Symmetry: C3
Subunit: 153 residues, 3 copies
Protein backbone atom coordinates (compact mmCIF):
# COMPACT_ATOMS: atom_id res chain seq x y z
CA UNK A 1 0.00 0.00 0.00
CA UNK A 2 2.71 2.43 -1.12
CA UNK A 3 5.54 2.90 -3.62
CA UNK A 4 8.34 0.65 -2.34
CA UNK A 5 7.42 -2.98 -1.58
CA UNK A 6 8.40 -4.89 1.54
CA UNK A 7 9.74 -7.81 -0.51
CA UNK A 8 10.80 -7.77 -4.18
CA UNK A 9 11.79 -10.78 -6.36
CA UNK A 10 12.71 -10.73 -10.03
CA UNK A 11 13.08 -14.00 -11.96
CA UNK A 12 12.13 -15.79 -15.19
CA UNK A 13 9.29 -18.19 -15.91
CA UNK A 14 9.67 -20.64 -18.81
CA UNK A 15 6.95 -22.45 -20.77
CA UNK A 16 7.62 -25.31 -23.22
CA UNK A 17 4.32 -26.48 -24.64
CA UNK A 18 3.72 -30.17 -25.24
CA UNK A 19 3.64 -30.77 -29.00
CA UNK A 20 2.65 -34.44 -29.03
CA UNK A 21 6.27 -35.60 -29.27
CA UNK A 22 8.30 -33.87 -26.49
CA UNK A 23 7.09 -35.39 -23.18
CA UNK A 24 10.49 -35.15 -21.47
CA UNK A 25 11.10 -31.49 -22.39
CA UNK A 26 7.60 -30.04 -22.08
CA UNK A 27 6.46 -28.09 -19.02
CA UNK A 28 2.88 -27.38 -20.09
CA UNK A 29 0.09 -28.73 -22.27
CA UNK A 30 -3.02 -27.38 -23.89
CA UNK A 31 -6.11 -29.26 -22.81
CA UNK A 32 -8.52 -28.08 -25.56
CA UNK A 33 -8.37 -26.99 -29.15
CA UNK A 34 -9.31 -23.32 -29.58
CA UNK A 35 -13.02 -23.09 -30.45
CA UNK A 36 -12.33 -20.84 -33.45
CA UNK A 37 -13.32 -17.36 -32.21
CA UNK A 38 -10.89 -15.41 -34.33
CA UNK A 39 -7.39 -16.36 -35.39
CA UNK A 40 -5.49 -15.62 -32.13
CA UNK A 41 -6.21 -18.85 -30.27
CA UNK A 42 -9.13 -17.51 -28.16
CA UNK A 43 -10.03 -20.17 -25.63
CA UNK A 44 -6.83 -22.25 -25.89
CA UNK A 45 -6.30 -23.32 -22.27
CA UNK A 46 -2.89 -24.46 -20.99
CA UNK A 47 -1.91 -26.09 -17.71
CA UNK A 48 1.71 -25.71 -16.64
CA UNK A 49 4.34 -26.75 -14.09
CA UNK A 50 7.32 -24.69 -15.17
CA UNK A 51 10.65 -23.64 -13.73
CA UNK A 52 11.46 -20.26 -12.24
CA UNK A 53 15.13 -19.37 -12.78
CA UNK A 54 17.30 -16.40 -11.83
CA UNK A 55 18.82 -16.14 -15.32
CA UNK A 56 17.32 -16.61 -18.79
CA UNK A 57 18.32 -20.26 -19.24
CA UNK A 58 15.41 -22.71 -18.87
CA UNK A 59 17.95 -25.37 -17.84
CA UNK A 60 19.27 -23.38 -14.85
CA UNK A 61 18.69 -24.75 -11.36
CA UNK A 62 15.17 -23.57 -10.45
CA UNK A 63 14.58 -21.36 -7.44
CA UNK A 64 10.83 -22.16 -7.54
CA UNK A 65 8.17 -23.66 -9.76
CA UNK A 66 5.07 -22.04 -11.20
CA UNK A 67 2.00 -24.31 -11.26
CA UNK A 68 -1.31 -23.21 -12.68
CA UNK A 69 -2.89 -22.25 -15.98
CA UNK A 70 -3.21 -19.63 -18.63
CA UNK A 71 -5.55 -19.15 -21.53
CA UNK A 72 -5.80 -16.91 -24.56
CA UNK A 73 -8.82 -14.66 -24.61
CA UNK A 74 -8.87 -12.13 -27.47
CA UNK A 75 -10.56 -12.38 -30.86
CA UNK A 76 -8.50 -9.89 -32.88
CA UNK A 77 -5.01 -10.09 -31.29
CA UNK A 78 -3.22 -12.17 -28.66
CA UNK A 79 -4.17 -11.66 -25.01
CA UNK A 80 -4.05 -14.03 -22.06
CA UNK A 81 -5.15 -14.60 -18.51
CA UNK A 82 -3.30 -16.41 -15.73
CA UNK A 83 -3.85 -18.00 -12.35
CA UNK A 84 -1.07 -19.87 -10.68
CA UNK A 85 1.02 -20.60 -7.60
CA UNK A 86 4.72 -19.99 -7.17
CA UNK A 87 5.96 -22.95 -5.12
CA UNK A 88 9.23 -22.49 -3.18
CA UNK A 89 10.97 -25.53 -1.71
CA UNK A 90 14.60 -24.57 -1.14
CA UNK A 91 16.85 -24.06 1.86
CA UNK A 92 16.20 -20.34 1.28
CA UNK A 93 12.37 -20.18 0.95
CA UNK A 94 9.60 -22.67 1.68
CA UNK A 95 6.09 -21.54 0.90
CA UNK A 96 3.76 -20.44 -1.87
CA UNK A 97 2.42 -17.27 -3.52
CA UNK A 98 -0.97 -17.24 -5.28
CA UNK A 99 -1.31 -14.96 -8.30
CA UNK A 100 -4.04 -14.15 -10.83
CA UNK A 101 -4.96 -11.61 -13.45
CA UNK A 102 -4.90 -10.36 -17.00
CA UNK A 103 -1.69 -10.88 -18.94
CA UNK A 104 -2.20 -7.98 -21.38
CA UNK A 105 0.22 -9.29 -24.01
CA UNK A 106 -0.01 -6.15 -26.16
CA UNK A 107 1.36 -3.96 -23.38
CA UNK A 108 5.07 -3.40 -22.58
CA UNK A 109 4.33 -4.19 -18.94
CA UNK A 110 1.29 -5.45 -17.07
CA UNK A 111 0.33 -6.26 -13.51
CA UNK A 112 -1.39 -9.25 -11.93
CA UNK A 113 -2.47 -9.56 -8.28
CA UNK A 114 -0.64 -11.49 -5.59
CA UNK A 115 -3.73 -12.57 -3.68
CA UNK A 116 -2.25 -14.70 -0.92
CA UNK A 117 0.71 -16.67 0.31
CA UNK A 118 1.58 -19.53 2.60
CA UNK A 119 4.55 -20.79 4.57
CA UNK A 120 7.35 -18.26 4.47
CA UNK A 121 4.93 -16.07 2.46
CA UNK A 122 2.04 -16.41 4.91
CA UNK A 123 -0.71 -13.90 4.12
CA UNK A 124 1.29 -12.05 1.48
CA UNK A 125 -0.44 -9.57 -0.80
CA UNK A 126 0.93 -7.50 -3.64
CA UNK A 127 1.55 -7.23 -7.37
CA UNK A 128 3.19 -9.48 -9.94
CA UNK A 129 4.50 -7.58 -12.96
CA UNK A 130 5.00 -9.46 -16.23
CA UNK A 131 7.27 -8.43 -19.09
CA UNK A 132 7.86 -10.67 -22.12
CA UNK A 133 11.48 -11.61 -22.45
CA UNK A 134 11.24 -13.95 -25.46
CA UNK A 135 8.70 -15.97 -27.39
CA UNK A 136 9.53 -18.48 -30.12
CA UNK A 137 6.49 -19.09 -32.27
CA UNK A 138 4.11 -21.25 -30.26
CA UNK A 139 6.84 -23.52 -28.85
CA UNK A 140 8.45 -21.55 -26.03
CA UNK A 141 8.13 -18.37 -24.08
CA UNK A 142 9.92 -16.72 -21.20
CA UNK A 143 8.37 -14.07 -18.93
CA UNK A 144 10.27 -11.88 -16.50
CA UNK A 145 8.14 -11.84 -13.35
CA UNK A 146 8.71 -9.10 -10.78
CA UNK A 147 7.00 -9.97 -7.49
CA UNK A 148 6.31 -6.95 -5.27
CA UNK A 149 4.78 -7.72 -1.88
CA UNK A 150 3.16 -4.86 0.01
CA UNK A 151 1.96 -6.86 2.99
CA UNK A 152 4.64 -8.98 4.64
CA UNK A 153 3.92 -10.79 7.90
Amino acid sequence: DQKKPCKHFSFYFHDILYDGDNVANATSAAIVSPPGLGNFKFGKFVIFDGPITMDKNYLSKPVARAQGFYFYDMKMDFNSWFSYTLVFNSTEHKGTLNIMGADLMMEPTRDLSVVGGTGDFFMARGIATFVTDLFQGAKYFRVKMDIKLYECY
Copy 2:
Protein backbone atom coordinates in the same frame (compact mmCIF):
# COMPACT_ATOMS: atom_id res chain seq x y z
CA ASP B 1 -14.48 -3.77 6.45
CA GLN B 2 -17.74 -1.96 7.20
CA LYS B 3 -21.12 -1.01 5.71
CA LYS B 4 -20.33 1.78 3.24
CA PRO B 5 -17.56 1.11 0.70
CA CYS B 6 -14.76 3.50 -0.18
CA LYS B 7 -15.45 3.14 -3.92
CA HIS B 8 -18.67 1.93 -5.57
CA PHE B 9 -19.26 1.21 -9.30
CA SER B 10 -22.43 -0.12 -10.89
CA PHE B 11 -22.42 -1.22 -14.54
CA TYR B 12 -23.50 -4.01 -16.92
CA PHE B 13 -21.56 -6.97 -18.25
CA HIS B 14 -22.68 -8.54 -21.54
CA ASP B 15 -22.01 -12.06 -22.85
CA ILE B 16 -22.72 -13.18 -26.44
CA LEU B 17 -21.70 -16.80 -26.80
CA TYR B 18 -20.05 -17.99 -30.00
CA ASP B 19 -22.52 -20.25 -31.83
CA GLY B 20 -20.27 -21.43 -34.67
CA ASP B 21 -21.54 -18.72 -37.03
CA ASN B 22 -21.25 -15.31 -35.25
CA VAL B 23 -17.49 -14.57 -34.96
CA ALA B 24 -17.89 -10.80 -35.33
CA ASN B 25 -20.65 -10.47 -32.71
CA ALA B 26 -19.55 -13.01 -30.12
CA THR B 27 -17.71 -12.02 -26.93
CA SER B 28 -17.22 -15.48 -25.44
CA ALA B 29 -16.91 -19.13 -26.41
CA ALA B 30 -17.35 -22.46 -24.73
CA ILE B 31 -14.22 -24.56 -24.89
CA VAL B 32 -15.74 -27.97 -24.00
CA SER B 33 -19.01 -29.78 -24.40
CA PRO B 34 -20.71 -30.44 -21.04
CA PRO B 35 -19.78 -33.94 -19.85
CA GLY B 36 -23.43 -34.86 -19.22
CA LEU B 37 -23.76 -34.63 -15.42
CA GLY B 38 -27.40 -33.65 -15.35
CA ASN B 39 -29.31 -31.48 -17.78
CA PHE B 40 -28.13 -28.01 -16.64
CA LYS B 41 -24.83 -27.86 -18.51
CA PHE B 42 -22.60 -28.92 -15.58
CA GLY B 43 -19.00 -28.48 -16.65
CA LYS B 44 -19.63 -26.22 -19.67
CA PHE B 45 -16.65 -23.84 -19.49
CA VAL B 46 -16.70 -20.43 -21.21
CA ILE B 47 -13.91 -17.92 -21.79
CA PHE B 48 -14.95 -14.32 -22.35
CA ASP B 49 -13.75 -10.82 -23.27
CA GLY B 50 -16.92 -8.80 -22.91
CA PRO B 51 -17.89 -5.16 -22.67
CA ILE B 52 -18.81 -3.32 -19.49
CA THR B 53 -21.32 -0.54 -20.20
CA MET B 54 -23.07 2.07 -18.06
CA ASP B 55 -26.47 1.35 -19.62
CA LYS B 56 -28.14 -1.88 -20.73
CA ASN B 57 -27.12 -1.68 -24.41
CA TYR B 58 -24.32 -4.09 -25.38
CA LEU B 59 -23.41 -1.69 -28.20
CA SER B 60 -22.77 1.28 -25.87
CA LYS B 61 -19.24 2.65 -25.60
CA PRO B 62 -17.54 0.40 -23.01
CA VAL B 63 -16.13 1.84 -19.82
CA ALA B 64 -14.10 -1.35 -19.23
CA ARG B 65 -13.80 -4.93 -20.39
CA ALA B 66 -14.25 -8.13 -18.41
CA GLN B 67 -11.78 -10.90 -19.31
CA GLY B 68 -11.86 -14.30 -17.71
CA PHE B 69 -14.07 -17.37 -17.51
CA TYR B 70 -17.18 -18.88 -16.08
CA PHE B 71 -18.51 -22.39 -15.88
CA TYR B 72 -21.74 -24.10 -14.94
CA ASP B 73 -21.50 -26.38 -11.94
CA MET B 74 -24.85 -27.78 -10.76
CA LYS B 75 -26.47 -31.12 -11.60
CA MET B 76 -30.13 -30.33 -10.89
CA ASP B 77 -30.45 -26.60 -11.72
CA PHE B 78 -28.29 -23.85 -13.21
CA ASN B 79 -25.39 -22.50 -11.13
CA SER B 80 -22.10 -20.97 -12.17
CA TRP B 81 -18.68 -19.91 -11.00
CA PHE B 82 -16.57 -16.99 -12.22
CA SER B 83 -13.03 -15.69 -12.19
CA TYR B 84 -12.14 -12.64 -14.19
CA THR B 85 -10.45 -9.26 -14.45
CA LEU B 86 -12.12 -5.93 -15.08
CA VAL B 87 -9.70 -4.04 -17.34
CA PHE B 88 -9.98 -0.23 -17.39
CA ASN B 89 -8.18 1.73 -20.11
CA SER B 90 -9.89 5.13 -20.35
CA THR B 91 -8.94 8.71 -19.63
CA GLU B 92 -10.90 8.22 -16.38
CA HIS B 93 -9.48 4.91 -15.02
CA LYS B 94 -6.44 2.81 -15.94
CA GLY B 95 -5.98 -0.39 -14.01
CA THR B 96 -7.52 -3.76 -13.23
CA LEU B 97 -9.69 -5.48 -10.61
CA ASN B 98 -9.47 -9.24 -10.02
CA ILE B 99 -12.68 -11.01 -9.00
CA MET B 100 -13.71 -14.60 -8.25
CA GLY B 101 -16.48 -16.59 -6.68
CA ALA B 102 -19.76 -18.43 -6.88
CA ASP B 103 -22.41 -16.96 -9.15
CA LEU B 104 -25.41 -18.48 -7.34
CA MET B 105 -27.82 -18.12 -10.26
CA MET B 106 -30.86 -19.22 -8.23
CA GLU B 107 -30.49 -16.31 -5.82
CA PRO B 108 -31.87 -12.77 -6.36
CA THR B 109 -28.44 -11.39 -5.48
CA ARG B 110 -25.05 -12.93 -4.84
CA ASP B 111 -21.57 -11.77 -3.92
CA LEU B 112 -18.15 -12.58 -5.34
CA SER B 113 -14.79 -11.42 -3.92
CA VAL B 114 -12.68 -8.59 -5.27
CA VAL B 115 -9.33 -10.14 -4.43
CA GLY B 116 -6.90 -7.57 -5.81
CA GLY B 117 -6.37 -4.65 -8.12
CA THR B 118 -3.66 -2.92 -10.07
CA GLY B 119 -2.93 0.51 -11.51
CA ASP B 120 -5.53 2.99 -10.34
CA PHE B 121 -6.99 0.08 -8.31
CA PHE B 122 -3.68 -0.93 -6.71
CA MET B 123 -4.25 -3.38 -3.85
CA ALA B 124 -8.04 -3.06 -3.91
CA ARG B 125 -10.16 -5.52 -1.97
CA GLY B 126 -13.92 -5.81 -1.68
CA ILE B 127 -17.09 -7.39 -2.99
CA ALA B 128 -18.64 -7.73 -6.44
CA THR B 129 -22.42 -8.18 -6.33
CA PHE B 130 -24.15 -9.81 -9.30
CA VAL B 131 -27.81 -9.48 -10.24
CA THR B 132 -29.22 -10.93 -13.46
CA ASP B 133 -30.65 -8.25 -15.67
CA LEU B 134 -31.63 -10.38 -18.69
CA PHE B 135 -30.90 -13.74 -20.24
CA GLN B 136 -32.07 -14.86 -23.67
CA GLY B 137 -31.98 -18.62 -23.90
CA ALA B 138 -28.35 -19.65 -24.22
CA LYS B 139 -27.43 -16.84 -26.63
CA TYR B 140 -27.03 -13.73 -24.49
CA PHE B 141 -27.01 -12.57 -20.92
CA ARG B 142 -26.49 -9.31 -19.09
CA VAL B 143 -25.41 -9.03 -15.45
CA LYS B 144 -25.55 -5.89 -13.35
CA MET B 145 -22.27 -5.84 -11.43
CA ASP B 146 -21.97 -3.65 -8.34
CA ILE B 147 -18.32 -3.27 -7.32
CA LYS B 148 -17.85 -2.28 -3.67
CA LEU B 149 -14.25 -1.69 -2.58
CA TYR B 150 -13.52 -1.66 1.14
CA GLU B 151 -9.77 -1.15 0.89
CA CYS B 152 -8.73 1.77 -1.30
CA TYR B 153 -5.09 2.86 -1.44
Copy 3:
Protein backbone atom coordinates in the same frame (compact mmCIF):
# COMPACT_ATOMS: atom_id res chain seq x y z
CA ASP C 1 -1.24 -12.33 10.57
CA GLN C 2 -0.09 -14.39 13.56
CA LYS C 3 -0.13 -17.91 15.04
CA LYS C 4 -3.69 -18.39 16.29
CA PRO C 5 -6.50 -17.64 13.82
CA CYS C 6 -9.61 -15.61 14.59
CA LYS C 7 -11.89 -18.33 13.19
CA HIS C 8 -11.05 -22.02 12.68
CA PHE C 9 -13.20 -24.68 10.93
CA SER C 10 -12.28 -28.31 10.33
CA PHE C 11 -14.45 -30.48 8.06
CA TYR C 12 -14.35 -32.98 5.18
CA PHE C 13 -14.76 -32.44 1.46
CA HIS C 14 -15.92 -35.38 -0.68
CA ASP C 15 -15.47 -35.91 -4.43
CA ILE C 16 -17.26 -38.64 -6.44
CA LEU C 17 -16.21 -38.36 -10.06
CA TYR C 18 -18.75 -38.94 -12.81
CA ASP C 19 -17.87 -42.22 -14.55
CA GLY C 20 -20.42 -42.11 -17.38
CA ASP C 21 -22.93 -44.22 -15.43
CA ASN C 22 -23.42 -42.64 -11.95
CA VAL C 23 -25.28 -39.33 -12.53
CA ALA C 24 -27.22 -39.50 -9.26
CA ASN C 25 -24.19 -40.24 -7.06
CA ALA C 26 -21.52 -38.11 -8.72
CA THR C 27 -20.47 -34.71 -7.37
CA SER C 28 -17.89 -33.80 -10.00
CA ALA C 29 -16.96 -34.45 -13.62
CA ALA C 30 -13.87 -34.18 -15.74
CA ILE C 31 -14.38 -31.92 -18.71
CA VAL C 32 -11.34 -32.99 -20.81
CA SER C 33 -9.26 -36.07 -21.37
CA PRO C 34 -5.68 -35.62 -20.14
CA PRO C 35 -3.49 -34.53 -23.07
CA GLY C 36 -0.91 -37.24 -22.36
CA LEU C 37 1.94 -35.34 -20.68
CA GLY C 38 3.18 -38.18 -18.53
CA ASN C 39 1.18 -40.90 -16.85
CA PHE C 40 -0.23 -38.95 -13.86
CA LYS C 41 -3.19 -37.30 -15.56
CA PHE C 42 -1.51 -33.91 -16.21
CA GLY C 43 -4.16 -31.54 -17.48
CA LYS C 44 -7.23 -33.54 -16.38
CA PHE C 45 -9.62 -30.77 -15.30
CA VAL C 46 -12.55 -31.45 -12.95
CA ILE C 47 -15.49 -29.26 -11.97
CA PHE C 48 -17.20 -30.07 -8.69
CA ASP C 49 -20.15 -29.27 -6.41
CA GLY C 50 -19.44 -31.46 -3.42
CA PRO C 51 -20.61 -31.76 0.16
CA ILE C 52 -18.74 -30.53 3.20
CA THR C 53 -19.49 -32.72 6.24
CA MET C 54 -18.38 -32.68 9.88
CA ASP C 55 -17.64 -36.41 9.90
CA LYS C 56 -16.11 -38.73 7.28
CA ASN C 57 -19.40 -39.96 5.79
CA TYR C 58 -20.21 -38.46 2.37
CA LEU C 59 -23.90 -39.08 3.12
CA SER C 60 -23.93 -36.94 6.30
CA LYS C 61 -26.01 -33.77 6.33
CA PRO C 62 -23.76 -31.13 4.72
CA VAL C 63 -22.74 -28.03 6.62
CA ALA C 64 -21.66 -26.34 3.35
CA ARG C 65 -20.89 -27.10 -0.27
CA ALA C 66 -17.64 -26.67 -2.16
CA GLN C 67 -18.08 -25.43 -5.75
CA GLY C 68 -15.18 -24.92 -8.10
CA PHE C 69 -12.51 -26.91 -9.90
CA TYR C 70 -9.29 -28.79 -9.60
CA PHE C 71 -6.81 -30.10 -12.10
CA TYR C 72 -3.80 -32.38 -12.11
CA ASP C 73 -0.56 -30.71 -13.09
CA MET C 74 2.53 -32.91 -12.71
CA LYS C 75 4.29 -35.04 -15.32
CA MET C 76 6.10 -37.56 -13.10
CA ASP C 77 3.78 -37.92 -10.06
CA PHE C 78 0.34 -36.73 -8.97
CA ASN C 79 -0.10 -33.05 -8.08
CA SER C 80 -3.12 -30.80 -8.28
CA TRP C 81 -4.33 -27.24 -8.15
CA PHE C 82 -7.63 -25.91 -6.80
CA SER C 83 -9.87 -22.88 -6.91
CA TYR C 84 -13.26 -22.98 -5.30
CA THR C 85 -15.88 -21.42 -3.07
CA LEU C 86 -17.23 -22.81 0.17
CA VAL C 87 -20.93 -21.93 0.15
CA PHE C 88 -22.72 -21.82 3.53
CA ASN C 89 -26.52 -21.70 3.62
CA SER C 90 -27.59 -22.90 7.07
CA THR C 91 -29.26 -21.36 10.10
CA GLU C 92 -25.71 -21.18 11.52
CA HIS C 93 -23.71 -19.56 8.65
CA LYS C 94 -24.75 -17.81 5.44
CA GLY C 95 -21.95 -16.65 3.20
CA THR C 96 -19.01 -17.80 1.10
CA LEU C 97 -15.24 -18.25 1.31
CA ASN C 98 -13.05 -18.10 -1.81
CA ILE C 99 -9.96 -20.33 -1.85
CA MET C 100 -7.17 -21.09 -4.32
CA GLY C 101 -3.76 -22.66 -4.50
CA ALA C 102 -1.51 -25.63 -5.02
CA ASP C 103 -2.71 -28.94 -3.62
CA LEU C 104 0.75 -30.52 -3.24
CA MET C 105 -0.51 -34.11 -3.12
CA MET C 106 2.93 -35.56 -2.29
CA GLU C 107 3.12 -33.61 0.97
CA PRO C 108 1.60 -34.69 4.32
CA THR C 109 0.02 -31.25 4.63
CA ARG C 110 -0.29 -28.27 2.33
CA ASP C 111 -1.77 -24.79 2.44
CA LEU C 112 -3.98 -22.88 0.03
CA SER C 113 -5.03 -19.21 0.36
CA VAL C 114 -8.39 -17.98 1.59
CA VAL C 115 -8.53 -14.91 -0.64
CA GLY C 116 -11.92 -13.45 0.24
CA GLY C 117 -15.31 -14.04 1.76
CA THR C 118 -18.84 -12.77 1.60
CA GLY C 119 -21.93 -12.65 3.79
CA ASP C 120 -21.10 -13.87 7.28
CA PHE C 121 -17.50 -14.20 6.00
CA PHE C 122 -17.32 -10.68 4.54
CA MET C 123 -13.74 -9.77 3.64
CA ALA C 124 -12.21 -12.86 5.23
CA ARG C 125 -8.59 -13.74 4.53
CA GLY C 126 -6.52 -16.68 5.71
CA ILE C 127 -5.28 -20.17 4.99
CA ALA C 128 -6.96 -23.43 4.01
CA THR C 129 -4.94 -26.50 4.98
CA PHE C 130 -5.55 -29.76 3.11
CA VAL C 131 -4.74 -33.25 4.35
CA THR C 132 -5.78 -36.38 2.44
CA ASP C 133 -8.08 -38.54 4.47
CA LEU C 134 -8.83 -41.25 1.89
CA PHE C 135 -8.65 -41.87 -1.83
CA GLN C 136 -10.12 -44.88 -3.62
CA GLY C 137 -8.47 -45.30 -6.98
CA ALA C 138 -9.86 -42.61 -9.26
CA LYS C 139 -13.45 -42.95 -8.01
CA TYR C 140 -13.58 -41.11 -4.70
CA PHE C 141 -11.51 -38.95 -2.43
CA ARG C 142 -11.99 -37.18 0.86
CA VAL C 143 -9.92 -34.20 2.03
CA LYS C 144 -9.84 -32.82 5.55
CA MET C 145 -9.94 -29.04 5.13
CA ASP C 146 -8.86 -26.83 8.02
CA ILE C 147 -9.95 -23.23 7.44
CA LYS C 148 -7.95 -20.68 9.43
CA LEU C 149 -9.07 -17.06 9.07
CA TYR C 150 -6.66 -14.35 10.16
CA GLU C 151 -8.80 -11.37 9.21
CA CYS C 152 -12.33 -11.48 10.58
CA TYR C 153 -14.63 -8.48 10.19
